[PDB]
Every structure is written in structure tokens, then in C-alpha cells.
Amino acid sequence: SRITNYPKLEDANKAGTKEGYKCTLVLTEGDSALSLAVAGLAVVGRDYYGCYPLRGKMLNVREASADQILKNAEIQAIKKIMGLQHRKKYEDTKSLRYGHLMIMTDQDHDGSHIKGLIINFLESSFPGLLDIQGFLLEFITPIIKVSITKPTKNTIAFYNMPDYEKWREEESHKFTWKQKYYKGLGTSLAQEVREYFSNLDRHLKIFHSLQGNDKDYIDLAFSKKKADDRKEWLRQYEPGTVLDPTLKEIPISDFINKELILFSLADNIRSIPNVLDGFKPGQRKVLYGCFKKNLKSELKVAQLAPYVSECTAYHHGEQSLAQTIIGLAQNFVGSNNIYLLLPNGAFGTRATGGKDAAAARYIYTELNKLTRKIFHPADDPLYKYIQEDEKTVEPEWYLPILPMILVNGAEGIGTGWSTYIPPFNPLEIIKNIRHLMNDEELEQMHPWFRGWTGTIEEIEPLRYRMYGRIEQIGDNVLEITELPARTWTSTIKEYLLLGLSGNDKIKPWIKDMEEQHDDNIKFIITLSPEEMAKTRKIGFYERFKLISPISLMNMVAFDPHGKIKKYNSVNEILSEFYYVRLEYYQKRKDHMSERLQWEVEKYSFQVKFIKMIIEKELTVTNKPRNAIIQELENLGFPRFNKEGKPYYGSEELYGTYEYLLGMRIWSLTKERYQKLLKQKQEKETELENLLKLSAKDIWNTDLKAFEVGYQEFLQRDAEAR
DNA sequence: CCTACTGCTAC
DNA sequence: CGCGGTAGCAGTAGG
């Protein structure tokens, strides 16, 4: 018998027929993987192999209602292809269209997550299915491939970070070699693909049937009721605890504690921001990219996203990055207190909370002039730029001149952990920073929203109420002029529309409603005298949904050292920023003075070079470079590398005399010579001015520059609304 | 009362 | 031109 319901399924020729137990179904993550699976069939044969693509992140079936499951076509499609049913407990794979299930995911953290979900699903929906030994299979591929180029030539495949790392430290210096990030599982030149299948047993790893503590670990990971435990579970994890590359047997308990946990750690890394710059990695890559490029002139979002992605080794879908760019540019009330990117187009409105944004090919963005005032360029050299794909990318964190995480706040959902931080007032933030600068007590700050005209009152510490504005403008007529921040116009619209026309469950309580919004919120509502009175008993704000809470009880972020931390007060966050920022200011000036000192050396020796040539003390025309090089070092001329570091001793390590001989013949003309002397004098003065400052002096200079910049920003934002 | 929803970066 | 589906957490409003 043949199936009909599913097109994309390549059904094993002997599926569910007397041979169904032998047959294997390969579940692929995405069509790229699927393409590889189907290509594999041409090698291993159709008779005993089939494949069906998993659409995306699979539904977690524990914590899901029978109707939500039943509604899920993916899970159903699997149950039909595998001839699966719930009933009793599974004793033998005999009942099924297939006797084996293989999981082809892309060999990244999200791949592991998919595996965990498939496992979770099987263990939960089917009693006694995973007990069958050798039922659940895994198809695996290398992580990084290395090529040995100038010595003895062989290629090394590395299945994890630790193995590639131990080799990198203990073997890589002995060869000339490259590291390639592995791609696809549905990329590799298909002809190598034929080799994976030819000897596939090596790429196949089997999941050991359920054993003690395997069912418990599955629940720990996927049970909606155990978020707190997961938090602890991640604290326990020990770096370098990774599953053994060569075992051929995987116990579920450590698939979860050695592979799934890896995704979880990565989940929080991308979903929860760092306390110092208030960025999630995706956002930080966007800003880095905008710094790399000169994003003073605008380009479109659909173009910016791939450009950032390419230059920051972003390995996820560009669509995710596009939305993030849009997120950084949004300027409607309730979004960004300060947007670092300019919304040049339909970047979404307050009506739907940005969801009404146009697609990326329509909108454009550039840097906000203010952004560089916040993220000072002089600090760039100080950061620790992450090394990825045999290449350098964005820093671990930026260090704005004020804690931007407090300016804009943040929202995220990870694993075990979650986060909410409300926006605050840049002015108040700068006030406290000044207090700290002066050993003064901090003022307490309260959530603050750019362009918002409601009221916010504190009830308990870490708890606030947020009010819109409702006014009685006539006998029987109310007017709404403000909503709680983060309450979208459409939400209240649907609500009023409900009262106006009533409902199956609820009687209408509104006579008429009109919308007169301008650059503001204007709901004109009419109530029958009967409803007016009723509304008074209930409360006008209560009954029109003009009250929202703000919780500061879940303010989570990574600390300076990359450790997830829960902060119990806003000032704690500010204080932790302040001291790292203070440290990096002294650090910035020490770096600048060093750099400036080298420049004065470079200018001085260039001047000596030209002066000597003019004075006819030195001749270069002819005199083969080797013999010119000796003269230079004999005269005390240091070499310079590309960073601009001097060498006086006698490669990038040593430097060159290119800073002299690489000068343009133009440089020998008096007008050039004069300009060179001016530049050197300018550099010496820069050095003299620099030394005359303290860390706090410099910070303070940046702060005032920003304040001025911020004032204009506020004006432009009011002018554009 | 348990439920279902919102927010958000990823598949 | 455009729609939709899943995870994961803390909290709030809905049936």
C-alpha cells in the first residue's frame, strides 16, 4: 500500500510491507538537508530508506493540548508515514511503516535542539517506543575541515570545538594550513556527499534505549514546569564537557547534558543582552557593521542585513537580522528611547507595535548622528574582537559612555532564563553617573518613555503602574488621549469595537466610537447614561484598559565577564557599568598616548629622512635596497610595522622601512616638507594635551558632547512626530 | 481556576 | 504582494 497525503516524502519502496521493521525513515531539518538525504538514496537504495523533511522547530508535545497536537500537520504527517499510534505500550517495531528513524540535522546548536524535540516527542507521545534498542538513529557530519598546504598534505575533519582546539594549540604551528567553517548538510559538493553515504555507518550514531535517568533528563529539558531547574542545570555545566566524537553509541542522558545543553547556553547568548552595551550579539554585529562601513549615507535594509551578516560571520537567516535592524531603527512611541539607526521609511508604527513595518526592500537606514557620540570611536581599539571562522568579527561588547541597556531596556526569552528591563531617562542616567563620579548618593530612577505623555507611579520597589489618559469632554462623552506605553492602538480599537457591537458572550456597552488620531492618540467615545454610571463604579481607566504594570523583578543580563546575572536594582546595573567604564577611560588614554608617541616617532624619523636627503647627507637614487637598509638602521632609524609600532633593535613582528621609502616623491618637495613639520607639531601638542587629562576628564568631555547631541536628537524626534 | 496570550531571535 | 507555523520565560488578562 502507498501513501498519498504527503508529496515531499520519498517513501521507501518496502515501507510498512513485510519489511517495514528493516526500513529507515530519515527526518531532515530543512530542504537543504532533505536534498542531501534524497541524493543519498541514489547511493543506498530506495527499498529500505525514505526521507521526510521536518518543517522547523518541532512542537513540544508535553505542555500541548490534544487539539494543538492534532492540529499540527507536521507531527501528524510523521505519525502517518511511520504508521504510528499511541495505544498501549510499544513492544516491537513490527507495527510500523518503518523500523528505524534517523535524524538529519545541520550539525549546529539548533540542530541539537531539533533532536531533543524529536526525542522528547517520541518519548512522550509513545509509551515504550524508545525502549526498543537501535530504533533512534543520528546522521552526523564534521564541524570544521582543515587543509595542510605547504608541508605534507592531508585533511583533518573535526567533529567538535575541543578536538579542533587541542589540535590548534598542539599541532597547527607545525604546518601551513587553513580552517574552513563547515556548511550545509545540503551544500557539500554533492560528489563528496556520495562518500558520506558510501560509508554512512561511520556517520551513523545510535541512541541507547531508555535507561535510568533518561526519562528524567528529558523532562528537565522540555517540561514547561521546570524553568527554575534549567537555570541550575546550566550553572552546573562545565566547559569542555562535550560528547565523545567517536562512540557510535549515545546515551540520552548525556546527549542532553553534552549536546542539548550547548544549544541552551547558545540560546541565552543570543536572546539575552550584555549589561555593558545592552546588546544581543545580533544587534552588536549590526552596529559593528555600520561602523565598518561608513553608514552616514543610507542604504536599504534588505541590503544592509546581508552585508552585516557577511562581515560578522553571522550563520543564521538574514531575515532574522533584517528584523533586528528594523528593531534598532524604530522611533514610534513605546519603542526606542534612542534609536541608533534612522527609520528612513515604513519602519512600523505604534498602532501595532511595529508589526505594520514594510518589508526590508522598501525601507532604508543609516547611523543616527548621535550614535557615534554614544559609542565613541576612540574606544574601538580597546575591545576584544571575537575570532570566528579563521577571521575577526564584532567585539564581546561595546562600552558606550552611558549604560545603553538602561536607556532602551531589553526583552528576551532564553532557556531557564528570561529578561525584562524597561527604558529609562538618559538625563537621569547621566545625573547618577555624575553622582558616582563625585562619591555622591544615587537618586532612584523610574521607567521613562521617549515622547510618552502618561503617568507612572511606584507601588512597591521593582513595581510600577502605568496610566493612559481618559477625560470626560461632554455629558456622556469620554476622550482617550494617552495609552499605557507598550499598549498598541489596535488593541484598544478592537476592544472598543467589541463594546460597540457587543458579543456572543458579552452585551454591548458602547453607543458610538470615533478615531481622530493625529500625531497623538484620540478616541472619542459615547456612552448611554446607563453605562456612564456603571463605568464610574468600575473606574474609567480600569474599564477602558488604560492601566498596565511594569515589573523590574526579572532584570537579567550577562555581566562584564559573560556570566548571566539577575540584578535586584536599577542602580546596581548602573554601578556595574560605571566601574568598568571608568576603568576603560584610563585605559583609552593610556592607549592613545602610546599610539601618539609612536606617531611622533614616525613623523620625526620621516623628517630626519627628508632633512638628511635635502642636506645631501643621504642618497637613495641607486644603492641597492639591501645597502640602503643598512644605512638606515646605522643612522638609528627604527622600523615600523603596519600597526605603527616602532622597532629599534636590528615581518609583521619586526616591521619595515616602508614608512620612509614608501613615501611619495612628492614628500621631498619643500611644501610637503613643511606640511610634515606641521603634522608633527600637531601630534606633539595632541600628546601634551592628552597627558594633562584624567580618565574622568575625558569621560566628562564625551558626556557634554553627547548632551549637546542629545538635545538636537530630541528636537529632530519631536519635529518628526 | 487553569488557560492562553505577549514579547523576541531563531529554525 | 503576502500569509503562516514552532521554541523558550515571566507575567498578565481571558474563558
Q: Which residue among A519, A553, A587 closes a domain?
A: A553
Q: Are strands A24-29 and A100-104 parallel, antiparallel or unpaired?
A: parallel
What is the Cα Rg of chain A in Å?
32
| Measured CA A117 to C1' C8 distance, in angstroms | 13
- How many domains is chain A partitioned into structurally? 5
State whether A396 and A472 are in the same domain. no
Classify residue A4: in a domain, yes or no. no
CATH of the domain at A48: 3.40.50.670
Say yes or no: Cβ of A321 under 7 A from any atom of strand B: yes
End-to-end CA gap in chain A: 65
Classify residue A445: in a domain, yes or no. no
State whether A589 and A714 are in the same domain. yes
CATH of the domain at A278: 3.90.199.10
Integer Cα distance of A488 and A480 in angstroms: 13
Contact A364, A299 (CB under 8 A): yes
Say yes or no: Cβ of A263 under 7 A from any atom of strand C: no
Say yes or no: Cβ of A273 under 7 A from any atom of strand B: no
| Measured CA A168 to C1' B11 distance, in angstroms | 31
State whether A248 and A308 are in the same domain. no
Classify residue A297: in a domain, yes or no. yes
Q: Using the 8-state DSSP alphabet, how is residue A401 labeled?
A: S
Contact A508, A502 (CB under 8 A): yes
Binding residues of A for Mg(2+): 29, 106, 108
Classify residue A1: in a domain, yes or no. no
Amino acid at A475: D
Residues A202-227 as b/e (b if ≥16 CB within 10 A, e otherwise) read eeebbbbbbeeebeebbebbbbeeee
Q: Which of A49, A159, A181, A362 is catalytic?
A: A362
Closest CA to A157 of A99, A209, A202, A111: A202
* β-strand partners of A412: A419
Q: For residue A105, which nucleotide's C1' is closest to its Cα?
A: B11
Say yes or no: Cβ of A247 under 7 A from any atom of strand C: no
Instruction: State the method.
Output: X-ray
Q: For residue A353, which nucleotide's C1' is closest to its Cα?
A: B7
Say yes or no: Cβ of A365 under 7 A from any atom of strand B: no
Classify residue A3: in a domain, yes or no. no
CATH of the domain at A653: 1.10.268.10
How many CB atoms lie under 10 A from the CB of residue A166?
Answer: 12
Query: Containing domain of residue A472, as a range?
Result: 452-553
Classify residue A205: in a domain, yes or no. yes
- The helix (run of H) or strand (run of E) holding residue A207 is strand A204-207
Integer Cα distance of A585 and A579 in angstroms: 10
Q: Which residue among A508, A535, A568 closes a domain?
A: A568
Q: How far is CA A696 from CA A335, A402, A460, A513, A577, in A?
A: 32, 13, 35, 56, 14
* β-strand partners of A666: none
- What is residue A102's three-state secondary structure? strand
Report phi then psi at A355, rounded to 5: -60, -15
Cβ within 7 Å of strand C: which of A 322-381?
358-359
Integer Cα distance of A244 and A208 in angstroms: 14
State whether A40 and A82 are in the same domain. yes
State whether A295 and A277 are in the same domain. yes
Integer Cα distance of A330 and A340 in angstroms: 9
State whether A368 and A293 are in the same domain. yes
State whether A460 and A607 are in the same domain. no
The residue length of chain A stands at 721
Residues A379, A382, A384: CA angle, nearest 5 degrees = 125
Classify residue A134: in a domain, yes or no. yes
CATH of the domain at A162: 3.30.1490.30
State whether A241 and A165 are in the same domain. no
Classify residue A279: in a domain, yes or no. yes
Report phi then psi at A151, rounded to 5: -115, -90
The protein residue nearest C11 (Cα–C1') is A551
Say yes or no: Cβ of A554 under 7 A from any atom of strand B: no
Residue A120, C-alpha cell as written in the block: 522528547
State whether A172 and A132 are in the same domain. no
Handedness of CA A6, A9, A13, A15 (dihedral sign): negative
Q: For residue A415, which nucleotide's C1' is closest to its Cα?
A: C8
State whether A546 and A574 are in the same domain. no
| Measured CA A369 to C1' C1 distance, in angstroms | 34
Q: Which residue among A237, A271, A305 closes a domain?
A: A271
Strand B: which bases are under 7 Å from protein Cβ? 3-4, 7-11
Say yes or no: Cβ of A14 under 7 A from any atom of strand C: no
Say yes or no: Cβ of A547 under 7 A from any atom of strand C: yes
Integer Cα distance of A636 and A619 in angstroms: 16
| Measured CA A239 to C1' C15 distance, in angstroms | 46
Binding residues of A: 29, 106, 108
Q: For residue A420, which nucleotide's C1' is closest to its Cα?
A: C10
Please identify which residue in the block is written with the cell numbers 528505524.
A100
Contact A606, A663 (CB under 8 A): yes
Amino acid at A560: P
- Our answer to whether residue A217 is catalytic in this structure is no
State whether A204 and A133 are in the same domain. yes
State whether A561 and A593 are in the same domain. no
Q: How far is CA A335 from CA A241, A330, A349, A552, in A?
A: 40, 6, 9, 18
